[PDB]
């Protein structure tokens, strides 16, 4: 009964979205806004921001009520 | 409404809760807004790691919200000394509140108020997020934070230092206190203040340097401290084996950044090797 | 998240005749309690239709003066309320004057934008005894149009996809240059959305995708490949054809939107005064 990690299976309807960590070498971040050093300091990275407006950007695109 | 309002359960600053028939009912500024808050995030989201709102429904400025009642929290366990705590058992306890916290910062949501009594356990032995007034969406550039979210022996040392933009971290950090909390039967640090808060955290973990977290200078509350060394994990945690020293290290990350997110967590060889997490029906009842 | 939003599952429906259908069978409910509590006294759907749209662009005015400052993302979730709230209901039973305000206050509070109560209604332009009634009746109508809303209170917008979309076409999408020069005409043709009834018939992410598009071929480019080489939909061209077929199918919802006109916006502003004078 070993525990084996399984991702999370979500549907969203909509292309795919690059995974966070590699934002940075398809050239995303270039057109985010830079984290200033505060922001970095706790743990907020431009990665978030453009993951999550990828995301919503692509959420529910195909899906039809 | 169609509620017996059975049993009282408690009472906290915005609301009181009864036990109900199975459900728990909580009841110029109008409605409340943790009520609001609680109810528009816990709408989106649904997932057996995390509390399920039921229904809704109030009169005048006064709602009430409807949860699945829960029996137990890990507060009362961690707490109880009659039950032992087996290595099992904490990797399910583990395990689950790493997979509700996944899942619900996959929704780009933080908690906030992670703590052992904030994790919920009913009679099938299901852990559970509950609890979120304090929570708010993440991932935004345009939202501005404060920090004295998480009570205080949980809370973060960016949070303690004021970071005002945090991602899962502030989670990740509680939860790794939480494990502590399991694991020594007590408040791993247990401060009475904000300044001896940090104070233990550097007296235990070491006195973070410019190495460990490039940026902690540049946080608004930033103190510089004494140069602790730390206390080595493996003293602490004397009963702790390598791949839980791990895990324990990468959620004590000073680097928020560098500090393990929650599928990086659940991805670590800990939750795979023996012995495998306790079956939910199997977990001890306080 | 939309793709696991009560949004999606609950308030995007498959036409206007369905919420042509909730709109006129909320005007006989009205009707027949009114009846039943005792005329051209009633108003009809589309002078409701065109009441409420009047009413919308009220909102927006309100929203839009408001100080301090409001988000975009509380202006869209209280347009957003208040287009949910009457599909169902009645602006003869509950006013939208009303209904409006309470939108702007449970948008506010819903989407973390603090702001306290005597400085809401401050906004308002009345004397201090009409901002505590008005302040009154917000407080009284903030329950009922959380209830009406079924307690659904996140709104998924379209200015987050639009940005992602514009993050995505900078990264992915070298044929159109610059396409910060889609955003002013994209956001116009956004704000045309939002005056139709689009917003409960499709998905954020495709009314922003709609929008750019349109702005793209009002500039003249013609960006068919994005959607077939980028969103990789030349590998399932049904849905290709689908997902045109939406664009076209808000297009024409833009197209054939109707303003409403002075003349006929006072007959039936009399005639809403009339019946909340018997209600
Ligand atoms: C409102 C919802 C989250 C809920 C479902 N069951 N339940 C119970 N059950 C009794 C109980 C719980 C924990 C420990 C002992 C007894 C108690 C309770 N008390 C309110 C707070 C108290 C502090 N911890 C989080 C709780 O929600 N809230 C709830």
């Given at each position: 009964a070993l525990y084996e990690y399984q991702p999370l299976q979500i549907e969203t309807y909509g292309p795919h979205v690059p995974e966070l960590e590699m934002l940075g070498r398809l050239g995303y971040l270039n057109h985010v806004r830079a984290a200033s050093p505060q922001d970095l300091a706790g743990g907020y990275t431009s990665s978030l921001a453009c993951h999550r407006a990828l995301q919503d950007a692509f959420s529910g695109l195909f899906w039809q009520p | 409404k169609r509620y017996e309002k059975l049993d009282f359960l408690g009472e906290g600053q915005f609301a009181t809760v009864y036990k109900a028939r199975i459900v728990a009912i909580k009841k110029k500024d109008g409605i409340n807004r943790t009520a609001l808050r609680e109810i528009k995030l816990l709408q989106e989201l649904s997932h057996p790691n995390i509390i399920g709102l039921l229904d809704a429904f109030g009169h005048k400025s006064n709602i009430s919200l409807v949860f699945d009642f829960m029996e137990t929290d890990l507060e009362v366990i961690i707490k109880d000394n009659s039950l032992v705590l087996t290595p099992s058992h904490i990797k399910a306890y583990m395990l689950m509140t790493l997979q509700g916290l996944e899942y619900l910062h996959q929704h780009w949501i933080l908690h906030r108020d992670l703590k052992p009594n904030n994790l919920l356990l009913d009679e099938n032995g299901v852990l559970k997020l509950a609890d979120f007034g304090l929570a708010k969406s993440f991932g935004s550039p345009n939202r501005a934070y404060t920090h004295q979210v998480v009570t205080?022996?949980?809370?973060?040392?960016?949070?303690?230092?004021?970071?005002?933009?945090?991602?899962?971290?502030?989670?990740?950090?509680?939860?790794?206190?939480?494990?502590?909390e399991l694991l020594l039967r007590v408040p791993f640090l247990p401060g009475?203040?904000?300044?001896?808060?940090?104070?233990?955290?550097?007296?235990?973990?070491?006195?973070?340097?410019?190495?460990?977290?490039?940026?902690?200078?540049?946080?608004?509350?930033?103190?510089?401290?004494?140069?602790?060394?730390?206390?080595?994990?493996?003293?602490?945690?004397?009963?702790?084996?390598?791949?839980?020293?791990?895990?324990?290290?990468?959620?004590?990350?000073?680097?928020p950044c560098a500090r393990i997110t929650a599928t990086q967590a659940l991805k670590m060889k800990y939750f795979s090797n023996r012995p495998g997490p306790t079956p939910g029906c199997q977990l001890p009842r306080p | 998240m939309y793709h696991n939003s009560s949004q999606k599952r609950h308030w995007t429906f498959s036409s206007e005749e369905q919420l042509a259908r909730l709109r006129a069978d909320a005007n006989r409910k009205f009707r027949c309690k009114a009846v039943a509590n005792g005329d051209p006294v009633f108003l009809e759907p589309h002078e409701e239709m065109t009441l409420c749209k009047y009413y919308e662009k009220r909102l927006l005015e309100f929203c839009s003066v408001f100080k301090p400052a409001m988000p975009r993302s509380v202006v869209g979730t209280a347009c957003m309320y208040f287009k949910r709230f009457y599909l169902n209901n009645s602006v003869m039973e509950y006013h939208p004057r009303i209904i409006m305000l309470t939108c702007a206050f449970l948008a506010c509070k819903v989407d973390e934008f603090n702001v306290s109560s005597p400085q809401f209604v401050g906004n308002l332009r009345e004397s201090p005894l009409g901002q505590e009634k008005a302040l009154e009746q917000i407080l009284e109508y903030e329950l009922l149009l959380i209830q009406q809303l079924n307690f659904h209170l996140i709104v998924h917008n379209p200015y987050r996809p639009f940005e992602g979309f514009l993050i995505d076409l900078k990264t992915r999408y070298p044929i159109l240059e610059n396409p910060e020069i889609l955003r002013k005409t994209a956001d116009d043709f956004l704000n045309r959305i939002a005056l139709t009834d689009a917003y409960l018939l499709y998905t954020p992410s495709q009314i922003a995708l709609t929008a750019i598009l349109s702005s793209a071929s009002r500039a003249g480019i013609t960006m068919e490949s994005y959607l077939s080489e980028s969103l990789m939909l030349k590998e399932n061209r049904t849905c290709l054809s689908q997902l045109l077929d939406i664009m076209k199918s808000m297009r024409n919802l833009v197209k054939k939107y109707e303003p409403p006109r002075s003349e006929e916006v006072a007959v039936l502003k009399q005639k809403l005064e009339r019946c909340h004078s018997a209600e």
């Open positions: - | 205080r022996w949980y809370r973060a040392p960016e949070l303690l230092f004021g970071a005002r933009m945090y991602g899962v971290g502030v989670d990740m950090w509680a939860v790794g206190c939480i494990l502590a009475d203040s904000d300044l001896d808060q940090l104070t233990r955290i550097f007296e235990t973990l070491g006195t973070p340097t410019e190495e460990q977290w490039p940026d902690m200078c540049s946080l608004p509350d930033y103190v510089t401290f004494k140069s602790f060394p730390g206390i080595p994990l493996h003293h602490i945690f004397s009963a702790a084996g390598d791949d839980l020293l791990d895990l324990i290290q990468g959620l004590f990350l000073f680097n | -």
